[PDB]
Write an enzyme that holds these catalytic residues in place. Structure first.
Site, PDB file in Angstrom:
ATOM      1  N   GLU A 139       6.902   6.734  30.747  1.00 43.95           N
ATOM      2  CA  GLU A 139       6.580   6.987  29.317  1.00 43.95           C
ATOM      3  C   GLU A 139       6.833   5.746  28.469  1.00 43.95           C
ATOM      4  O   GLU A 139       7.693   5.756  27.598  1.00 43.95           O
ATOM      5  CB  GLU A 139       7.457   8.109  28.757  1.00 43.95           C
ATOM      6  CG  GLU A 139       7.373   9.419  29.512  1.00 43.95           C
ATOM      7  CD  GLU A 139       8.284  10.497  28.946  1.00 43.95           C
ATOM      8  OE1 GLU A 139       8.985  10.190  27.956  1.00 43.95           O
ATOM      9  OE2 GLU A 139       8.296  11.632  29.497  1.00 43.95           O
ATOM     10  N   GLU A 159       6.433  14.780  35.821  1.00 42.45           N
ATOM     11  CA  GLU A 159       7.337  15.729  35.112  1.00 42.45           C
ATOM     12  C   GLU A 159       6.530  16.867  34.481  1.00 42.45           C
ATOM     13  O   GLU A 159       5.523  16.575  33.817  1.00 42.45           O
ATOM     14  CB  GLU A 159       8.126  15.044  33.989  1.00 42.45           C
ATOM     15  CG  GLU A 159       9.045  13.910  34.426  1.00 42.45           C
ATOM     16  CD  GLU A 159       9.799  13.193  33.309  1.00 42.45           C
ATOM     17  OE1 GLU A 159       9.810  13.695  32.158  1.00 42.45           O
ATOM     18  OE2 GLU A 159      10.355  12.103  33.585  1.00 42.45           O
TER      19      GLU A 159
END
Lengths: 449, 449, 449
Positions: free
Chosen positions: A165, A354
């Site tokens: 991210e 995730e």
């Protein structure tokens, strides 16, 4: 209707290094921008820190034994750069390599297939003293640390992630300054975004030079951005969001370009800057899969209030059940995204690095965590994961965030994404009912929705 | 539309030791809590007892000859602990062993399959003098008597039940005190419920340690609990009922845990107990099936008035035909229960230890009972039993309660579940028409739906 | 399909000295441990003894005339040590010698082949006063008596057996104490097992020092021990049972070693005993054949409750027809054993010292014993005897237990293994139908099974 996933489909659970490891100054680990940020009042909820966390550094044998008891087929974890190079570059800390070398060899000798992230936000504080990810040099130093990991753990680890991210790291860490390293400047926030992507490009280039028999990708924060209404201003507003958010990191890595509609909104605020064209052919470097982290979906309207010309749609959003984070639950948002990644970007291989949810957990009078809402959340989202694979998507892997209750950054320990409860006073694990659920879902290779 | 059960389906009938045997002080049998409870005014209807009952102790040849004449494939009976150990522990009474040894061998020779219960409520009165089930020591004595039965018999008996309806023992016997041993205290009633389940665990653990080639389980008192209306207070009032009732014993045996929603109700009345963690893993000990005893269903509403938080929905229950026990007839309540045991608890092997009905029986001018209502009840509940097998349920056995008319506890002899009429003055058997029906049902292996 | 044995195949029947001879204190015969054990209440059924028995001592002429009438090719019998040495050692009783010398010569002259056992349990009671088989001196005295028999009967008797079933002597006589001399101590029971095998050795060693032109061996009690299930625990339990039982004698004699898995079991109870290494080379002394006595087979399961680590699998055994002894009928369980001896001890010459069955015999209104079940038993076991010879087994001889009805030790005369009926009031011989069947089986050299 009973769902069954492909027979080769890999089930996994995910953690980060800072969020579980602890031992923040042990065995020659150098200070990280998160150690530094966490130690300062006003940055973490209730003045929480990582320092100890789940103490996974010491208690990993216990954690594997649980991982195998549930029988995950892949464990996704993060390597601490500051354990490998306490000063980012130079003197190798063999103690830190030997930890992760040992950890990986305990996974391979149990049932479990390793999945390594190389940068999950814990930049050595030394490189932050020379500018950090603003200083382009850091992109080389990342490649040096990447090199050492590949020489040791290259071909025995099948799945690799360069970054986690980078969308958050730049936005929260370098513009809003609510994540580490706490910087608040817009120009800096874009220079880092680039420098991060570039570093991915350098690691993949080095990955190929060394010719490691494994698969590399990048783990991006990604939601779907729905328009508030089916109207020309709201469809456009939503395209511009996504483009500032996810596409800003999807299009450079998979199309070798930056999104135009977003770049136009930067220049309309009096900022350009010449990206060297050669960098974005180093970023675009072919990758074996795209990975992403999803939890929720965004509903954008047109707004001549807000310097971005758009805003969230408040009370479309106030029609959904919300997680403990305040994020909407909308399972069909994951399907549409998977289809959007498939349609655009040329039917790539997809991994979910995730997915998960945070609900207020309690240990009941029966000494058990009956988190029916996390299980409900899970199976809902996993029905739309399956639905995508049936309609042609190449979704090879799912990693459940997270294996353990962990340090949720600026929220502290106040939010629990774990299957496996962790008491942060005693460090006692109590596998959650979502844990036991997931065990069976792996075994059956699915569930009757 | 004609129904046929699986070709391996075992048809049976059930009785209990104190309810049919008599001979309450013969061949060195010790007193039981029931002997003691029966002998005291106000406890049994019409001052009845189980002193004599059906006198099965002497007339078991006659009963077997009847069992075979109907042709039951399995006879489910109970062993009197006070015939094996008059004092509960210490001096073995060989006279008592020899009786049950002899009985079992006459069953095996007559091509009837034995199904023993080890505790059917007749705790030696001596162990009640040292507290009874409240004194944990009892749970060890229960394993001693269990050891002796398994060492003899053992291999030659395929189906074992550790306990019968420990939900009734602890509720009726130890809280409402209308059953033996006539105690009235809530705290004790829960300490007994745990001490009972523990004793089951200890018998299964010892059953494995001796490695008896036969299948062991537990016979639990179960109904379905339907909400009065499809409303959030009533659905939740019906889910609390099942926990306090059946799930209180199901979940510890099959999930290794006590129901939360129930445990919360008990702490809201200032009662918590720290069940030792190692007891619950002993209770959860894997078992070969789950057995249960159904007759009716419950229809619960929300009720702040009742300190329980709920009460029976009398308004709804007064729309059904009712047995001679004021219990509703509702055949489809057996299906939904079989599905509930199948759905939760992971598609286990299911046995029906008991089903049946008590109607007023007369011997007519034709010297015959003609109890069309029992037969109508039977075939109505069995059609649902069959429906569940067809919709995937692993229901291996059905045991009709009861083979003989017998001593229905606090009700005395005033309630008949038989299929064989018994005149409690003469002790003459007259096979009921429900009996003759059942004979055909076993032969055809079914009847018309 | 009609079955025919090898042309050289020796058909025989067997008796023991104490079981048939009588004359327990006649012509200077010393008291034996069986005289002694028989005269004590509580040892023998109904207080029977072998004081008279069949009275073979006087009526042997009649018995040979019967043996030849049936036309057996060999008669296996035992020599009573106490008739040879009343005091175990020292003064020779010439009267005893002359009996057996006379007997053997009447057998040779009636074209029957003698087969002498040297010890069939009748240890002089004087040696039992100096410790018996626990005193190692006995093993020297056995050799003295063996020496005097060989001098006289050596050459002219072709087949010699040192001991009968030392397994039973030590186990039943010296641990359980339900055989003579009635001792109950485990340590002693193993010290005797060794001393017995040692004496066998010494007798072979002497048999070769004198070079008697005849074949010696040992008669061992042997069954096949099947595992209850084809599972690692139950296969291993069975191997340990056979090891404690037969293999405890097979291995020393044929492999010059005790079974390890058995020896471990004994040390795990705190018992190790240093066998002098030279004794085991003396025990191993090469032998012309191995003889054994079979009737039934065992079915062993795993059992941690039994301190042995195993127990009988009653659940299986209760599926067979049973003899009057209670022992299962399982013909194939001879085949498997003959293959096991063949495989595991280097395809030796095999004899059957004993095989036969006990069923309840009556003399019908026709004055005949039509014991079809004994004839069925026989032909079922002889079909598998044949089968094994076809599939390559070196089975040279079969001796039917027993010629006469006799004294079955602790069971008294209550059990009949004869093919000749004996009334134990009158001593009148009535050849059974099994006797007439065997006569035709010898003539035809087989039967159509």
């Amino acid at each position: 209707s009973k769902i069954t996933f492909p027979k080769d489909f890999i089930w996994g659970s995910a953690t980060a290094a800072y969020q579980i490891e602890g031992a923040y100054n042990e065995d020659g680990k150098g200070e990280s921008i998160w150690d530094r940020f966490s130690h300062t009042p006003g940055n973490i909820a209730d003045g929480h820190t990582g320092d100890v966390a789940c103490d996974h550094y010491h208690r990993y044998e216990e954690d594997i034994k649980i991982m195998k008891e549930i029988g995950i087929k892949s464990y996704r974890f993060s390597i601490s750069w500051p354990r490998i190079f306490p000063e980012g570059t130079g003197k190798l800390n063999q103690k830190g390599l030997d930890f992760y070398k040992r950890l990986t060899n305990l996974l391979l000798e149990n049932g479990i297939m390793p999945a390594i992230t190389l940068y999950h936000w814990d930049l050595p504080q030394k490189l932050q003293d020379k500018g950090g990810w603003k200083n382009r040099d850091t992109t080389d130093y990342f490649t040096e640390y990447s090199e050492v990991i590949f020489k040791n753990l290259g071909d025995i680890v099948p799945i690799w992630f360069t970054h986690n991210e980078p969308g958050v790291v730049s936005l929260l860490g370098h513009f809003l300054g609510i994540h580490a390293p706490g910087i608040k400047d817009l120009r800096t926030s874009l220079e880092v975004s680039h420098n991060l992507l570039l570093s991915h490009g350098k690691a993949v280039k080095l990955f190929r030079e060394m010719n490691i028999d494994a698969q590399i990708g990048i783990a991006l924060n990604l939601s779907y951005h729905y328009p508030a209404s089916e109207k020309a201003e709201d469809i456009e507003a939503a395209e511009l969001s996504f483009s500032l958010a996810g596409r800003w990191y999807l299009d450079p890595v998979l199309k070798g370009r930056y999104p135009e509609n977003a770049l136009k909104l930067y220049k309309k605020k009096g900022i350009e800057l010449s990206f060297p064209e050669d960098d974005l052919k180093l970023i675009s470097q072919p990758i074996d899969f795209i990975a992403f982290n999803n939890y929720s979906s965004e509903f954008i309207k047109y707004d001549p209030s807000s310097e971005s010309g758009f805003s969230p749609a408040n009370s479309i959003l106030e029609k959904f059940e919300k997680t403990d984070m305040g994020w909407i639950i909308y399972p069909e948002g994951l399907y549409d995204l998977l289809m959007l990644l498939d349609r655009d970007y040329g039917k790539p291989n997809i991994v979910i690095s995730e997915n998960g949810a945070a609900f207020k957990d309690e240990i009941g009078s029966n000494g058990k965590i009956e988190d029916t809402k996390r299980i409900q959340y899970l199976k809902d989202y996993l029905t739309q994961a399956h639905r995508a694979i049936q309609d042609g998507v190449n979704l090879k892997a799912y990693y459940l965030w997270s294996l353990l209750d962990n340090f949720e950054w600026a929220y502290g320990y106040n939010k629990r994404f774990g299957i496996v409860h962790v008491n942060f006073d005693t460090l006692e694990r109590k596998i959650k009912d979502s844990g036991y659920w997931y065990k069976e879902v792996i075994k059956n290779n699915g569930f009757l929705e």
